[PDB]
Each structure stands twice: as C-alpha cells, then as structure tokens.
Amino acid sequence: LTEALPKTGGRNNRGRITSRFIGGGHKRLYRIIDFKRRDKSGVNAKVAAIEYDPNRSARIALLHYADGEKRYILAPEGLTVGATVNAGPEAEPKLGNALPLRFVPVGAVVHALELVPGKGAQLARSAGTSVQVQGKESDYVIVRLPSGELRRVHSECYATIGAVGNAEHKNIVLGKAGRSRWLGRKPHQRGSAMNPVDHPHGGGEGRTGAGRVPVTPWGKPTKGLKTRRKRKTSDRFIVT
Amino acid sequence: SHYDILQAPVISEKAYSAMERGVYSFWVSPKATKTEIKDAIQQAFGVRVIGISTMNVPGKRKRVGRFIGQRNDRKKAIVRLAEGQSIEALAGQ
RNA sequence: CGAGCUGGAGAUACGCUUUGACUCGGGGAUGUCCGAAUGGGGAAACCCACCUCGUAAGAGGUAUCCGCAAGGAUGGGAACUCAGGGAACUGAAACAUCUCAGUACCUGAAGGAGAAGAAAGAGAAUUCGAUUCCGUUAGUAGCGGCGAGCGAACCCGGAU
RNA sequence: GAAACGAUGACUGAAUCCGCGCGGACCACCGCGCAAGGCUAAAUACUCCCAGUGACCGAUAGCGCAUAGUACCGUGAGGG
RNA sequence: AACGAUAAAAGAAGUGAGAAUCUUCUUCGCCGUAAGGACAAGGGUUCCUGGGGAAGGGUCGUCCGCCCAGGGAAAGUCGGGACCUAAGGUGAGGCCGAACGGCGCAGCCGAUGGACAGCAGGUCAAGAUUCCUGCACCGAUCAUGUGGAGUGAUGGAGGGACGCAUUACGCUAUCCAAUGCCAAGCUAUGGCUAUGCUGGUUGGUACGCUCAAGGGCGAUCGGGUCAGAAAAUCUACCGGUCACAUGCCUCAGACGUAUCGGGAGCUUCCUCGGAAGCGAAGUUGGAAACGCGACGGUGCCAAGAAAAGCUUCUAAACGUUGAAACAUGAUUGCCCGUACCGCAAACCGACACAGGUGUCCGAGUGUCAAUGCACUAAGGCGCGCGAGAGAACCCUCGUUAAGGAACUUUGCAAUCUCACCCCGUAACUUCGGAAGAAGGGGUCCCCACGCUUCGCGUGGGGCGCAGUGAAUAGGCCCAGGCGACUGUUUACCAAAAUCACAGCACUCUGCCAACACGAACAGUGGACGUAUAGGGUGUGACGCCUGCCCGGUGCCGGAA
Numbered sequence A: 001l002t003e004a005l006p007k008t009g010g011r012n013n014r015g016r017i018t019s020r021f022i023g024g025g026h027k028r029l030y031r032i033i034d035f036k037r038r039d040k041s042g043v044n045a046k047v048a049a050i051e052y053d054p055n056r057s058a059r060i061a062l063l064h065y066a067d068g069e070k071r072y073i074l075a076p077e078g079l080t081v082g083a084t085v086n087a088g089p090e091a092e093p094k095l096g097n098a099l100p101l102r103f104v105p106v107g108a109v110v111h112a113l114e115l116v117p118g119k120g121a122q123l124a125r126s127a128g129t130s131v132q133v134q135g136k137e138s139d140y141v142i143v144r145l146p147s148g149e150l151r152r153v154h155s156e157c158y159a160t161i162g163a164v165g166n167a168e169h170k171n172i173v174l175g176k177a178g179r180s181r182w183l184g185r186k187p188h189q190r191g192s193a194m195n196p197v198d199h200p201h202g203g204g205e206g207r208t209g210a211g212r213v214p215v216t217p218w219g220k221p222t223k224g225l226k227t228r229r230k231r232k233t234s235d236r237f238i239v240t
Numbered sequence B: 001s002h003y004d005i006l007q008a009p010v011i012s013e014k015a016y017s018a019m020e021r022g023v024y025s026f027w028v029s030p031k032a033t034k035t036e037i038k039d040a041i042q043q044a045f046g047v048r049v050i051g052i053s054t055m056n057v058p059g060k061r062k063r064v065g066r067f068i069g070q071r072n073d074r075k076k077a078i079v080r081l082a083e084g085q086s087i088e089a090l091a092g093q
Numbered sequence C: 001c002g003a004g005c006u007g008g009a010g011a012u013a014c015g016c017u018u019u020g021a022c023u024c025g026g027g028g029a030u031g032u033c034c035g036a037a038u039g040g041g042g043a044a045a046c047c048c049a050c051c052u053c054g055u056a057a058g059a060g061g062u063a064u065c066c067g068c069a070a071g072g073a074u075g076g077g078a079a080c081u082c083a084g085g086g087a088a089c090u091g092a093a094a095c096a097u098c099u100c101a102g103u104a105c106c107u108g109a110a111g112g113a114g115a116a117g118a119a120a121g122a123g124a125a126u127u128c129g130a131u132u133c134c135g136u137u138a139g140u141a142g143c144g145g146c147g148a149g150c151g152a153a154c155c156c157g158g159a160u
Numbered sequence D: 001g002a003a004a005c006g007a008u009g010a011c012u013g014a015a016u017c018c019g020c021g022c023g024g025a026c027c028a029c030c031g032c033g034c035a036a037g038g039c040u041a042a043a044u045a046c047u048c049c050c051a052g053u054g055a056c057c058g059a060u061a062g063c064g065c066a067u068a069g070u071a072c073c074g075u076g077a078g079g080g
Numbered sequence E: 001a002a003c004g005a006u007a008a009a010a011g012a013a014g015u016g017a018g019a020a021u022c023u024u025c026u027u028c029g030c031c032g033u034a035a036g037g038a039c040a041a042g043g044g045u046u047c048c049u050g051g052g053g054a055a056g057g058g059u060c061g062u063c064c065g066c067c068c069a070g071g072g073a074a075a076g077u078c079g080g081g082a083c084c085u086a087a088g089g090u091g092a093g094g095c096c097g098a099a100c101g102g103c104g105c106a107g108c109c110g111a112u113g114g115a116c117a118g119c120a121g122g123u124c125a126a127g128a129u130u131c132c133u134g135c136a137c138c139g140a141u142c143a144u145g146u147g148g149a150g151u152g153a154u155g156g157a158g159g160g161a162c163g164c165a166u167u168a169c170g171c172u173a174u175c176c177a178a179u180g181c182c183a184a185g186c187u188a189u190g191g192c193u194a195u196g197c198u199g200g201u202u203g204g205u206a207c208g209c210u211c212a213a214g215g216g217c218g219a220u221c222g223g224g225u226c227a228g229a230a231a232a233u234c235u236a237c238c239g240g241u242c243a244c245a246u247g248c249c250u251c252a253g254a255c256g257u258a259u260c261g262g263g264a265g266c267u268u269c270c271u272c273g274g275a276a277g278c279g280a281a282g283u284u285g286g287a288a289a290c291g292c293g294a295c296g297g298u299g300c301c302a303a304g305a306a307a308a309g310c311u312u313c314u315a316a317a318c319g320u321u322g323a324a325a326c327a328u329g330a331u332u333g334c335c336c337g338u339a340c341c342g343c344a345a346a347c348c349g350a351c352a353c354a355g356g357u358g359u360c361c362g363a364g365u366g367u368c369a370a371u372g373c374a375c376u377a378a379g380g381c382g383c384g385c386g387a388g389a390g391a392a393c394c395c396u397c398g399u400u401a402a403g404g405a406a407c408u409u410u411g412c413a414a415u416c417u418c419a420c421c422c423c424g425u426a427a428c429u430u431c432g433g434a435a436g437a438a439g440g441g442g443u444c445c446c447c448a449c450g451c452u453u454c455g456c457g458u459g460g461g462g463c464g465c466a467g468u469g470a471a472u473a474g475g476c477c478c479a480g481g482c483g484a485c486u487g488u489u490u491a492c493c494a495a496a497a498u499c500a501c502a503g504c505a506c507u508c509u510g511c512c513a514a515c516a517c518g519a520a521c522a523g524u525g526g527a528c529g530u531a532u533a534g535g536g537u538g539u540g541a542c543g544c545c546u547g548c549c550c551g552g553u554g555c556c557g558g559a560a
C-alpha cells in the first residue's frame, strides 16, 4: 500500500455520454508510473516490491534508485524483489533495463516502447504483450508490435527488456454479471433489441437483422476506418 | 454615534423582573454588533458590561384591509453589569 | 402666495403659522443597502478584508477596457433607425424552383431621431446637377415551374 | 437568361490625362462621369411622457385594472 | 350520497345565553421499534398569556393549528462564517468562434467530507452545552517571574490518509434479581401480618503508592549527492552499532477519599392549586452494545478522496543588552442560526386528505434468537357528527350435516400445512445440489437423580378434548414448454418466454487510435488507457455440435 493521486470517475465529456456504457466500479486511486525513465540514466535501482495496481492489467514494480527517489515501473514477466536495474545507453540488455533500440539486439523481446524520444512508453503496456526487435535500418529500427504489424521506430526511442507481467488474463473468467460491474456498466445493449428511432437495427416484429451497421450510420465487419496520413511512411505491412 | 443604536428599552414582565437582578434589556439596531452595542450602553449610562447576549426578532400583522400585512424587524440586547449595578432612575420604573 | 396648515386617512393627541407657515416655481445640501455594480466573496439587498487620513466615532480609496494624462467607455430605454444572422405555417387548390419574406424572431450598435449624402451618377435631351421624403409615372417596362404570382426607374409636380 | 453594372469568400492582380469608368453580351462611333479618403444641418419615422380635441367607450363597454400586474395559478419562463 | 379507517366509551362535577362535543375528576379502551421521544429538511409565529366567537372546523362549540392584542427566542466552547478542500462551478493571462458566446492552467467559489475549546445541575406561562449556580477549557493582547539565547516561510519532508467481511479480550451506556439497604403506611374479601405489598437504590469534578484488559512505540553515529528547485540539523536510500520475551509510553474503565449535584419522599402556606424549605439509602450477584479501549486480530479483491490545521526542516529576515517556551495574574470574547411543528391537522400532496418524507434513541415479561409476535412501562392517543334499530342487498369476518373440485376458462378464492428438537428422506445431477424432499414422532405441570448454563437428559407421577394450549407460523408431489442462473422492464391495464447477464464469435483500431460530443486547426470523452487494450455488431451458462450455395447485394483485394 503506497503513495499516488486520485483518479475520479467520469464517462461523458464537457457535456453528454460520448463513450457508450462505462459507469460502475470500485474507487481506485491513480499510481504515477515511470514511462520515460530518461532522467534516471546511470543510476541503479533495487526492486523494492511488485504491487496490485488497478487502472492497468499489468503488474507494477516499486523501484528505488540509490539517490533516494522511489518510482513505480511496469513490472515485467520474470522480475523479482532485490534484482537491481539501471537505465541509459550505458546499460545491459537484462530484465527491466531501459535502453534505446540501437543498443537493443535483434530478436530480443521488449515492452514499454516509445514512439518519439522523450514522451514515454506507448507500445506493449498490457500484461503479456511484447515487441520483438526485427532488425536495424537507418536511424530507425523495424519491430513486431503485439498486433503483428511491423513499424519503423527510430532507434533513439527507449524500451524495457522482457515481456510485460501479469502472466495471463485467462484463469480470470469473470463468472457473474457484476464482476463486469466491479469495473464497467452494463455493456453491449443490442441495437436489435432497440426501436427504429433509437438505432438502425431496431424494430420489426420479433428477433431479426438487415444490412449490418453501428449505433450511428457506418458498417462494422470489415471497413477500413484508418485515415490517409503521414505515419503510413514509418509503417510496413498492416493486416492483423 | 452612542445615543442612536439603543432605540427603546424592553418593556414586558420578564425584563422588569430581570431588572431586579441588575440585568437590562434593550431593543437595539439589528446591524449594531455586540462590541458596538457594549460600548453604546457603557458610555450613555456610565456603567461596565460584564456580559452581553443578543438576538434578532421578526414581525407580521394585519387586523383587516386586504393589505396582506408585513413584518416590523428587531434585535434585543440583554446585558449584565459588575457588582455595582443599576441604570439611572429608569430601572425602578 | 396671502391664512391657513398639521400626506391619501376620513382618527385622537401635540403643535406650527402675517418676525409670512401650507402650497406652487427654481436651485442647493443630505441620500443606508442591492443593482453596470466597480475591493474580494456571494444563493441581490448580505458576508469578509486591506490602505490612507483620523480624537474613538467616523470620512475617503481599492473592477476591467482606451489612452502621457486630461477625459472617455461598460448598464438602462415603449416604439422608430441601421447592421450581423435569419424561419415555418401559408399560397402555388398536391410539391421541390418560386411564394409567405429578408416578414417573425435572436443578436450588435446608436440617437432624439436615424439612415443616406456632394456623381467613376441618372439617361438619350450633347437635358439634369448630393441625399431623404410625398404625389405621379404605373400594375407601365420588366420578372416568373412565363404558373401562383412579383413588380421598377427616368420625365414631370411638391416638402426641404 | 443574350445578363451588363454593383458587391466579395478563394485565386490572380492594370493603366496615370494622345490616361481611366460607365452607357444591359460584345465591337466601332457618338455621349455622360474623375473610384480605390473623411465630415455634414433640413424635410422623414416613432410615441414612455405632456397638452388639446372626438356623429370614441361609459362598468360583461373602455386599457388587463374607475387601478392590479394585485389576489390567485405555475418549479419556472409565464399566465391572470 | 356523504360527514375521511370498526382504536370505544361511560358517568359525575364545573362553566356558560346556549354544552354529546370546552374544563376537571374517576373508570374504560387503543399504540408502545410507536400511534413514545430527539433532530434535519421544509414551514413561518402556527410557540406562551389574556381575550374573541363572523367566517374557517365535514356536526356543535363556551374550544382550536382560526380572529385580535401583548410577550417569548439570550452561545468564545453547539451548527455555519471570519479555516480546508471533492464533484461541480468559475477563471487575469492563454486557446476557439457570424454576433450573443464556447473552452481553459494556476488561483478562487463550492460540504454532503477534514479541522477545532464545556461538562453537571437549576429554572419563565413560553429559551437553554445559549440565562443563573458550581467548577473547568481554548486562542489572542498585555503586566510579573523563571529562561538565559534564537525564532524557524509563500518553499521541502513527515502527518492528516480513509476498503469490504469476519472476529479475540476488557469495559461502559443500559437491563434484571434478591429475606442487601433506605423510606412510607396499610392492610380486612378465606388467608398473610412480613421472609407481605409499594417506591427509590448515585451523576460532574478533584486528588489518590489501589485493581486493570487492551492499545502505541525502535534509538544513535555515519556515507553518496546522483533524490526532495536551492538549502536543511528534516526526509528518502545503503551501511555500522544494542533491537527474542521483555522493555518503555498511554490508562477504556473499575475502586478509595473528598466535594458539588441530584435523589424516594417528607414539610409549611395557599387567592384551588402551585410556590418555597428539608432530604433517606447508595449493597451483593447476573446480563450487556452497533458505543468506548483502539489506527486491535485475521481474511479477501473489485484494491478503498483532497486540502488545510498539525509535527519537523532549512531560504530570506530581524537577533544575540531585552529569545522561544513555561508558570501566575489581568484583559478580551465578532456575524448568522437557536420559539413552535417536524412519519405530520403546522413539510409535499387544492382539503384538519388512510399516500409520501433523510437520520437518531426506542424500556419490561414471555417466546432458540430478534428492532418478529402477544400483553404491557414511560409516554401518547380514542382518529371533530351523534343517537336508535337489528329488513332486502353490499362489504370485512366466524362456524358449518352429508358429500369433497362434482365449481370453473382455470381449485380463481378460501381452507389445509405452519415454530423449534429427534428420526427419516427418492429420481436425477454440473457432484454443490435437488432437501424443509417425501414421511414419522416429540412438545404442558410436578417430583427425584444426573449434568455445560437461560437450561437440558433419564426416570416416576399428574390434569384437560386439546400442551409452538392464545399471537407470529411452508401444503406437498409427478410430468412437460420457455428462459441456464441472481438481476431488469412498460411511474398509472403487460414482470414475461422481454432486456441484461457470465461465456462465444465476426470485425475495426499502432495512438493527436478507431469512435463520439462540438460554432471550432478550440476543447473533451475513449484513456492519465496502448492490441492479453479500446470501439461496434451478433449470439447468450454448460455439454455435444454448427452443414450446403459467393449468382444478386454489401465488404476486402486486383487493375490490362
């Protein structure tokens, strides 16, 4: 049980319900996690403890850097209490060390991957997710992201050795409605159980369906929702 | 100034018997706070107040005439003086 | 002004008045608190401060936007004026262009009025000579699912 | 529309008085004007308020009121 | 027609023009986890006193929550402000927008949370942690004395700081019992003559070598600057030195002593009923919190506000000749709330309306237990028409010969069953269940003996038609459809086979994500998340499974 900030609940924007469903669940305080790790380069840290920290799905390791500054870090699958850890270019590719992709070997499994130097971790953060290094290009490294997509991440971006913790959300089977409620409000309200007024599927006389669409107009099974943007150049082979 | 503030003394059977124990009651300005009320009595009567308690009082009448009526609005201050009590000759009343 | 007055209040008491009350004109001086509201806060009319002078009482100051400053501005107006924005019912015996109509409404700015105004003009006389307003031209010329229907201007006569 | 002229959001972007704009595509000729700077009384519109008048009303009329935006209704706008 | 719940009433005495209805006495009946009592909201003088008697009061009023007049409401310590922050609101500057305006960091506003000093009694007709009496406490300013030097932000750190379930030990509030104590008298109907009957049986404070469960705590010298913007003697980290039991520190509460208080009643006067004076006893044993000791123990996953006050640090600063702190005087003590109604005749419901309304206290006997059920204390009330009669019919009830579903759309309705203990218990199954299956027996009173008690067990005896003797109080079973299950819904004709659900799938989305709100190159939600995540569609536990057709339509992919 250790220090953090309060994460007050909210399911609607500066007015009305914008992200559908979302509502119940326990109180939960926000724990500040170290995603950047750069300002602690060269300083060694000891894994004080791993902790149950909601807001995440992935475990959290309580780190103590020899200077006195205690920081929380995404605990990776394998990290134990007492195991030392360091950040920077001058840092070994060992369990829990933060080092840019240029110093990171090929085929070597990583997580907490950035996208722009500084900013912080943005890829493979959930438990069990990992990015595997494919092979260095120019001032960019090709990687295999959790989805299966290949991205050009510029070598200068930090990473953490190993796959993310919390083994597997598998034996977690919820079981009863209300385990869902311990977290988020009655989800999936069928649009076919709605009225012509309410949603496009809604209406008719009994059980049905006729054209396949979401809440508003669109269509959902197979329809490229992606834009014709810049980031497409720093990307290779999408599908799955 | 002094001489304003304390509008009138409190008449009633309870104020007259409170008098008999050196305790004086007045209808004062509803805005005239305890300290200002303390000073005004102290000066105008030439006596020291050892304690002061006060409270605001509402109104509302009509006998006849569709003139729904209206309030009046007071504040009643009740003071106790140190051992050598009495106020003027307007205490024996 | 010249004997009354003491508000409607018709009610008793106290009184005031030719050393000119009362009422009528016209200027002053007071003018709590809220309200643009303006020290800060606020569920108007309440709560809480700081500065300066001051014998305590008490008096003055503490909003933002223009500009050296002087000095100006915020808010309020029944309708009328111009501007930004701008419907539908309705009519077309249905309706979509069209109509209702740049009407209703909202919003901004302002005044006792405003707007507009001193020809890169009107129009065919090598006439006129800033603008507005009224008469008339004239339901003309023209517009128009050339349908419903819409509808000028010059000339000339006047207000100025 | 044969649709000129004004105006202008986007993109362009001239001449300087043997110059420039217009005269209902457009060209010639004839004719009327000086843009891209500003100010401006008067006649005109209205009626919160005041006065005068009326083949206007006179208490179910005339303003909603012989005075009330009250009583009363409504959470409120509002209605009365 | 009705006069607003079937919780009653009776008589006597009084008052008055007038009395079923107002007052007083004596009974009666009704509530008593309430129909008693204390708030909050809301209402606004309805409160008390004297008077009234037109309307209001479903009747009558001599009365009232009505009408008139007078009065009553007292705070340094209670609640709110002069303190703090949450959601939210606002917001100089800053980001957008035809106008009006929309956002938005710090800050500010905002309690429903944090913080913080007073307890016991007395008493107006009507106020009381507010007034009076007794004795406290808090802050500030100053006077005196001790101290003899530091004080220690707008900043740092510690602290405030927080779940759900279950539970060990001590306690108190509070409750019971008795041939404990104290007080008052008397009783007789047949008895008792007190070992009967009735009532009362200790609060505040101070001091105390007295008994005491339970709760709380490491101390100090160092090292790195790379951590807290900087500094720190503070805090974090690593290390060295004594950390078993103990050891410190605090004492819920009990006991003793003293003192102020209260205390059953007794007493004197009385303008009819109050006022004043006095004042006994303080036991032994049992029970006992949701309160207190306490931030205790254990277990669990869904992982349980912030900010100020507070404590500790240094920056700046004034300073060491007059410090901070302690101690004893004195002085000081602002504003608003405080009556009354407040599960209701004073609030919301047009109505003195069978409805609704958040919190707290809520006694005794009996009953495994209990805030259930019956009766009942304290207390409150008999519901603002009444009186007769004893028809049809209608409503709410009790019993019912013989029969027992023949009723009917349908056992609709109403019976039967009904608590606790012992015995006993089926198919089927997901191995939990089905189960309170089904069915049987016990149940009161006395005495003896045995034992873990309020008690229970064995034995013998007694009484009635009958012993959970009244009240509360499952009828059960076989088979099928649908839906797995708990759950949700049509406020006011539909509770369901609807919706949701755990689980499955297709699919989209690489992050300024897809998607969604929006004047908007604003802002925001998805998400302080990141593909073991998020959107959308469908199916709907679990088991076995999920086939054929790609022509048309849509979606993805090709391009000569």
Ligand SMILES: [Mg+2]
Pocket: D059
């Ligand atoms: Mg008449």
Ligand SMILES: [Mg+2]
Pocket: D068, D069
């Ligand atoms: Mg009027």
Ligand SMILES: [Mg+2]
Pocket: none
């Ligand atoms: Mg905000």
Ligand SMILES: [Mg+2]
Pocket: none
């Ligand atoms: Mg009867």
Ligand SMILES: [Mg+2]
Pocket: none
């Ligand atoms: Mg007869």
Ligand SMILES: [Mg+2]
Pocket: none
């Ligand atoms: Mg079958």
Ligand SMILES: [Mg+2]
Pocket: E483
């Ligand atoms: Mg079901």
